[PDB]
Amino acid sequence: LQPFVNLLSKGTYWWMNAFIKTAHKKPIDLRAIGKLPIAMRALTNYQRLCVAFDAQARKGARAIWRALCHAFGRRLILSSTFRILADLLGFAGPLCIFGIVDHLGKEFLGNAYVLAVLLFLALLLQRTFLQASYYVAIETGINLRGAIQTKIYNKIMHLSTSNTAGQICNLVAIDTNQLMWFFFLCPNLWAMPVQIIVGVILLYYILGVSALIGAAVIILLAPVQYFVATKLSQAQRSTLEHSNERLKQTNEMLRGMKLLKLYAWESIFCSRVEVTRRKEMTSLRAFAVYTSISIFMNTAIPIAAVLITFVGHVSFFKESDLSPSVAFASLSLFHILVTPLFLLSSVVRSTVKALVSVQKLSEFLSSCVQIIGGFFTWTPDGIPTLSNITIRIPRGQLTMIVGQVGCGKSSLLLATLGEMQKVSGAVFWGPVAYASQKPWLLNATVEENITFESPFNKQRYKMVIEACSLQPDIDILPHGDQTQIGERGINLSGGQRQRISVARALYQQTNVVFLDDPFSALDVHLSDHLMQAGILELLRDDKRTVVLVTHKLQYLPHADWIIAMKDGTIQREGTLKDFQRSEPWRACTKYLSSAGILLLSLLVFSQLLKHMVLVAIDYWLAKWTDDQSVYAMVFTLLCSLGIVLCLVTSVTVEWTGLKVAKRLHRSLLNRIILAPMRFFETTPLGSILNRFSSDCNTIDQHIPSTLECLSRSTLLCVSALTVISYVTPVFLVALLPLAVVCYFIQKYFRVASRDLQQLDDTTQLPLLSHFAETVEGLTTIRAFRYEARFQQKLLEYTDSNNIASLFLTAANRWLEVRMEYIGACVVLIAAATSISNSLHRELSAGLVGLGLTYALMVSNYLNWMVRNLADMEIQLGAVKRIHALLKTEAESYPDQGKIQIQNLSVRYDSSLKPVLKHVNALISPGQKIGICGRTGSGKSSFSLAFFRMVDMFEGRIIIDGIDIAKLPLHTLRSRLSIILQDPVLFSGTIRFNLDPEKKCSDSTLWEALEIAQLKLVVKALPGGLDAIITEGGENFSQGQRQLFCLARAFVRKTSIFIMDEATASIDMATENILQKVVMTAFADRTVVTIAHRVHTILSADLVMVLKRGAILEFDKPETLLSQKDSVFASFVR
Ligand SMILES: Nc1ncnc2c1ncn2[C@@H]1O[C@H](COP(=O)(O)OP(=O)(O)OP(=O)(O)O)[C@@H](O)[C@H]1O
Ligand SMILES: O=C(O)[C@H](CC(=O)N1C[C@H]2CCCC[C@H]2C1)Cc1ccccc1
């Protein structure tokens, strides 16, 4: 609430003080953050931008710039006016140091004390204009993002469906941010020229022509600073290529982990991910080189400029003798030109990226029922897709739209709606509940999807779910209801999704309903259930106009009207009779522990030795000004020794950063591979994967750079407070109060800012997610006429994004205003005490300048120390949670088919109910054993029990004379065939997905593919036995993929085969093909089949029934059918 408060509280952000103190105690919630001010709302900014657009266009890429300039120009020069005004008041430090030091070494301005309060007042007054300049630029930048995101969205509700779903979200998340961040750094575009030009002009007057030569070096090194920034960002992209390639290879490893650990291919796929990692680490060296140079230039160009400015002034020109006032006033000017001169690279880089974004943004912004005649074409001009489409469906009566495949069926429905440009014809036609041919699901609850922003009724909902008969399906789902169906509907199944969209159509209370192929993936049994109960007994009962378009003609007789489509034309439209007649410092220690004692010693000793040179340089200047070639000799040497150490301390932090980033990931990968199968099922995949994506990214690129920023600022602030204390020892008395105050300000910030950074991120996701939802189901939204209702949901989402981001900026300004006040209070104590000592005691004029030139800079170092420490705390969440995951568990480490089980006391998990108990069996070599039982009756345990994956087997299994327990895991899994229920084939060649051990012969591998009756399609692939297959994908069918897994099984030749519900998720013909292959090809080798199919184990040598723990296991299935009273298997079959 900055506008309401007065000028003083607004400048000092006193209104934020109570919020900070309150948030320190309890976490920030949406209730804690208030509603947005009227002036800064998404709707208000959007209306202002629309007014600007109307004004500009009333008389392209130029227009949007004019509208952005017109709407947000008044609150932008007001930001630039402060920035310029703060720049001029900035030179009241360097100029007043000139005044103070000169008077000591030699009209109220003639007094040294008077200038000590002018230095105090100007520094106090500058460091609020500068901060109020940052805020108003930010508050305009954030208010702009609110206006554009609404502007982008209001275009989405219009664009034709002929066209890029992911581009629009990218346009919101990246292209708008680059435009927003241009308005953060917009005033600098007019303030760098003013601040630098006055700066360089001042240096000439203070020091002479020699100040230009030193000033030219810094300016001339801005392009080289910029060039490194270009080479770095190129290197980051090339690293981003391998990281995305790595995450694909890792994701396939975690998802299909059970298949891998069954075949003992965990090491092979772990080896393949490391090969991609090493390439990423190679491309990450160049990112370290061009980050090392970037740190080297930013701390060795200021030193180089000082070296050439002073040495050149005394050696070449032989001008006026160097004096403490001139040398230290000029030195303090360099410290305040480098910050503008080194950010100018990022300002130009941002401006060239903002020019692209606007052009990219302006490219996006430019993109019953009776019909008379009618010609509709998806293209703006071309062959009309619908021709002679003249229809008149009745009101309140069901109508069927039936025709050939791909012949104007779904287009005609969209022709009735407004998504088809009319070449000609006349159409006259409220909101319509349209069940899309391709169903779309909101990223929300199953209850939310069906109600779809409509009031809930208990009776209505009960009938709908019973009619669609999707409730029994949700019963098997992991959650009873309110399941979070994310993007793409991965949680739900294809057939289940189709019902939901039809359920959404059937739930709504509207007169006209267009159900576009409700039975596309609906089973024939349920399809009649949905049609009879829902379409007829529910939809037709309510006197609701229903239009249905499906291939199943069985429901044609139960239809008032029916139309026939031919070649995209409505040939005839009549009734059935008419138609028939016509036709954490603990984590930081863990991070620095892995670097190595050698590097860690070199890292620490280089930092401490560098800042004993960067002070011994400045102290030597204070001794110099008071033989004159001798002083230049030592000062040149120290400047070179300062530069050399700036190179060493820039390589080491990056060299260390790679050494940890390499070891931490590699040590992480080898740990989860050895985790037992129980760990992967219990822990959600999202938890493990995000460690490899974000945390291994934060350590790769963010920690090493931040660790340098925090270590460089902390030592500078220690050096600044030591030099300023050696000059005036009385300053130590005031150091304790300013240490206690500076601690609490740091504490309340880190507590409050950490909350808002998390709150900022968690409100970003709903905003982007809403853009994806709108574009994916744009046709459905405009069918319900929920465009206005959906657009309103954006304003709430983006307002909760701005206010969460408008406190993160008011928190930073709160901190920087406090520290700059503390720093402006240190400069008074430093000035007051040194001048007291210099005039009365025997202090020198040079040491006075040395104290002041650090007092001015102790405000910045205090600010970087607390801001970097805030970021270093957050970025150490990467190491903290990796080290937690890194301590997971670790598993310990066939000639004849005789397998024996000793009581099989196997427990599905630690300290749980035993799945199977007291199960004794003995299968002779070369015998086909079958296992059948109820779902969850322990049959599924015996499948994984033979592979020691059940980690609590309190019994014994003897296979071919040995024990499956004593033998090591990677030597027992590798010699036992398995066929999981759901087939999976991982990315790689066919030769590298059927024998990754690279031991199979080329001729043999072809026979195995042919043995599975698969050689024809395999040979048909390009290359042959080397075609680059994709994970799942379309290169193979579901029957073929399950068929290929049989070929992979035949490759092992382990003489013991275990099949676990291979029949499921397969075709009936393929099951006969698979069963015939197993019966014929695998005649020997003791095939064991655990499945629910009746006919799978009918011909087996022996069949074992499974009760809660064990049931009758008749060796002869023929005897079992008679003995079981035709109940156990005969009745089930
Ligand atoms: N973005 C698009 N650009 C061009 N044509 C399009 C586009 N979207 C759809 N179409 C047209 O719509 C046709 C499919 O709809 P149509 O009603 O003609 O067939 P259908 O019988 O409903 O098909 P299906 O069984 O695939 O649902 C395509 O063949 C194409 O001519
Ligand atoms: O001190 C800072 O360096 C500023 C940090 C800050 O205030 N914010 C708030 C913004 C919210 C939206 C996204 C994050 C930014 C970061 C950034 C900045 C603003 C203006 C000028 C220079 C730097």
Residue numbers in the entry: 218 to 276, 283 to 329, 350 to 406, 413 to 616, 678 to 739, 768 to 921, 997 to 1039, 1060 to 1326, ...
The authors write:
The KATP channel is a hetero-octamer complex composed of four pore-forming Kir6 (kir6.1 or Kir6.2) subunits and four regulatory sulfonylureas receptor subunits (SUR1 or SUR2). KATP channels can sense intracellular ATP/ADP ratio using the inhibitory ATP binding site on Kir6 and the activating Mg–ADP binding site on SUR, coupling the metabolism status of the cell to its membrane potential. In pancreatic β-cells, KATP channels are mainly formed by Kir6.2 and SUR1, and play key roles in controlling insulin secretion. Small-molecule drugs that inhibit the pancreatic KATP channel are widely used to boost insulin secretion for the treatment of diabetes and are therefore named insulin secretagogues (ISs).
Therefore, we used a truncated construct (SUR1core) that encompasses 208-1582 of SUR1, including TMD1, NBD1, TMD2, and NBD2, for subsequent structure determination. Purified SUR1core protein was supplemented with ATP and MTG for cryo-EM sample preparation and data collection. Image processing yielded a reconstruction with an overall resolution of 3.27 Å. In the presence of ATP and MTG, SUR1core shows an inward-facing conformation with its central vestibule widely open to the cytosol. ATP binds to the NBD1 and MTG binds inside a pocket in the central vestibule of SUR1. The MTG-binding pocket is formed by residues on TM7 and TM8 of TMD1 and TM16 and TM17 of TMD2. The central negatively charged carboxyl group of MTG makes electrostatic interactions with positively charged R1246 on TM16 and R1300 on TM17. The benzene ring of MTG stacks with the phenyl group of F433. The bulky hexahydro-2-isoindoline group binds in a hydrophobic pocket surrounded by L1241 and T1242 of TMD2 and I381, I385, F433, and W430 of TMD1. In agreement with this, the hexahydro-2-isoindoline group of MTG is near the S1238, and the replacement of S1238 with a tyrosine would generate sterical clashes with MTG, abolishing its binding.
